[PDB]
């Protein structure tokens, strides 16, 4: 019954964070925060509730008692997007709280736009995977349809998008669309229509089959 | 510095037994101020702490783990390991093995200050797929990149010109396609100039089907 909240947030580069953690009880050993930055393992930063871990920068903070702690980021910094976990241990157990998501709002920012034709070696094997990149961009959200012909397409295409940029704190996206070699011969114009907020009106990408 | 390694299998079948291990190195794990536990971490969930283990050979466990979960230690290779018996999807995690480090006099005080990077493990009765590698041929600045198609399971790496190339390199998530198999794409942006100059190879490892590719990425 260990609590975190907020569950997640959106700030601003230099803004004041703070997140808070609730132990399950009255805790008699150390109450640590771990840093875990997307695709890696967590990182000690605070432990037993206020002690920096040597190397730790300044800016990160704990506080609080009995059962009531709080993490502290006084001024964000883009390569703070992380999840922060607080971690009790009692009753012989070690607990982890359900984790704190941080991430950066920005400026909009307008995504450079590619697109790539299916190799040679792929169209040997039966198979038609046409890519669309979005390159930088911020809000994370993004509109991607696909045209064939001019034909709007539907069912056969799946997007994944980057975790936020450490730097810039941008997103990109790529967006597949697969078909049969047969089909994929059956047409010459395939194009990537981008929809965004950055962007005034949508940008169209596209190449002719052979 | 005090370093930790896991290492084991990434496919382990239903109602079998997961087994890992992990490799200390940088400091002895005779140490009398730690202790070497097991966390695991189930794909977009939190943290569940396994269980630890002495170096003389005491254990303890999550009780909703203690029924299925051997916590073990070998001195001598300096490895401690975790044996996890029938497992279900349920077990299906990122393993990461940590230090824990203890101190008081009248309390025993504990945090876990080193971790490993992470075993993926995944229970399946599929078999392990290594994955088909293709270019994304570029048509001042541009894109090119590598698609990496059909695999199973997580995960595969990808590296450019064998890690010399690094800035502006996008590795996406990876995409449960509609045939149960994993797809990725890797990205970077380069200058335009460099195009059929300069030679761009993606390296892709795939540790569950022992794959191994070089693709190198040509213009047009
Ligand atoms: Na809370």
């Known amino acids: 019954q260990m609590t975190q909240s907020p569950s997640s947030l959106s700030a601003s580069v230099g803004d004041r964070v703070t997140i808070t953690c609730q132990a399950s009880?009255?805790?008699?050993?150390?109450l640590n925060w771990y840093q875990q930055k997307p695709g890696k393992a967590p990182k000690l930063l605070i432990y037993?509730?206020?002690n920096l871990k040597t190397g730790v920068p300044s800016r990160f903070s704990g506080s609080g008692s009995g059962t009531d702690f709080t993490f502290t980021i006084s001024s964000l910094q883009p390569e703070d997007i992380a999840t922060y976990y607080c971690?009790?241990?009692?009753?012989?157990?070690?607990?982890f709280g359900p984790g704190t998501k941080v991430d950066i709002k920005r400026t909009v920012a307008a995504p450079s736009v590619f697109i790539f034709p299916p190799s040679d070696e792929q169209l040997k094997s039966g198979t038609a995977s046409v890519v669309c990149l979005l390159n930088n961009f911020y809000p994370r959200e993004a509109k991607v349809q696909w045209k064939v012909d001019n034909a709007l397409q539907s069912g056969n295409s799946q997007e994944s998008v980057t975790e936020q940029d450490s730097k810039d704190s941008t997103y990109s996206l790529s967006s597949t669309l697969t078909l049969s070699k047969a089909d994929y011969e059956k047409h010459k114009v395939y194009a990537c229509e981008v929809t965004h907020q950055g962007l005034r009106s949508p940008v169209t990408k596209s190449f002719n089959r052979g | 510095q005090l370093q930790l390694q896991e290492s084991g299998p990434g496919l382990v079948k239903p109602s079998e037994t997961l087994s890992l291990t992990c490799t200390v190195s940088?400091?002895?794990?005779?140490?009398?101020?730690?202790?070497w536990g097991w966390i695991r971490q189930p794909p977009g969930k939190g943290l569940e702490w396994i269980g630890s283990?002495?170096?003389?050979?005491?254990?303890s466990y999550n009780p909703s783990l203690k029924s299925r979960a051997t916590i073990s230690v070998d001195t001598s290779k300096n490895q401690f390991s975790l044996n996890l018996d029938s497992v279900s999807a349920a077990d299906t995690a990122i393993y990461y093995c940590?230090?824990?480090?203890?101190?008081?006099?009248?309390?025993?005080?504990?945090?876990?200050?080193?971790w490993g990077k992470g075993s993926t493990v995944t229970v399946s009765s599929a078999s392990t797929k290594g994955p088909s590698v293709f270019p994304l041929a570029p048509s001042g600045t541009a894109a090119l990149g590598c698609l990496v198609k059909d695999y199973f399971p997580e995960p595969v790496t990808v590296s450019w010109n064998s890690g010399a190339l690094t800035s502006g390199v996008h590795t996406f998530p990876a995409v449960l396609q509609s045939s149960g198999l994993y797809s990725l794409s890797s990205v970077v942006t380069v200058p335009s100039s460099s195009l059929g100059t300069q030679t761009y190879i993606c390296n892709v490892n795939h540790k569950p089907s022992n794959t191994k590719v070089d693709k190198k990425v040509e213009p047009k």
């Open positions: 940590a230090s824990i480090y203890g101190s008081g006099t009248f309390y025993y005080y504990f945090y876990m200050d080193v």
């Open positions: 037993d509730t206020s």
């Open positions: 009880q009255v805790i008699s050993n150390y």
């Open positions: 940088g400091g002895s794990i005779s140490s009398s101020s730690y202790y």
């Open positions: 971690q009790q241990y009692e009753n012989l157990q070690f607990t």
């Open positions: 283990v002495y170096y003389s050979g005491g254990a």
